[PDB]
Amino acid sequence: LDENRNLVNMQGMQLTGYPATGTPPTIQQGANPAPITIPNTLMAAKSTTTA
Amino acid sequence: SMQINLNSTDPVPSKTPFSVSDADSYNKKGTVTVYDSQGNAHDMNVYFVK
Structure with missing residues (x-):
């Protein structure tokens, strides 16, 4: 991992x-x-639509 | 020259009036690079709607 949050190999x-x-x-x-x-x-919430 | 395969069960797009902005307005997008008589690359996109 890297500070830019990229999936980075060793090179x-x-x-x-x-x-x-x-x-x-x-x-x-x-x-x-x-x-x-x-x-x-983070992620935002979604209101209930079925119970 | 370009070769493609298409789905039989692929439905028509939801937003019927075609627009090159939204993805759901079409079915498939492909790209190609064309070179003019000056050495400039232009990107030509082909859009497939059933």
Whole structure:
């Protein structure tokens, strides 16, 4: 891991793959691969819709 | 020249009026690079809607 929260191998290269966006996030398979990150930003809540 | 495969059970996109901005407005996106007579690369995107 790295301070930029990139998936970094020993020599500094960043692992590449599909990113995820949304709430809840979903993979954009059609989008070209991008350097994957693991940030520390929290998630927002979703109200109840079924009980 | 470009070759693709398509899904039989793929439905039509939700937002029927086509727009190049939103992903759900189409079914598939592909890219290609074209070179002009000056050495400049342009990106041509093909969009597939069933």
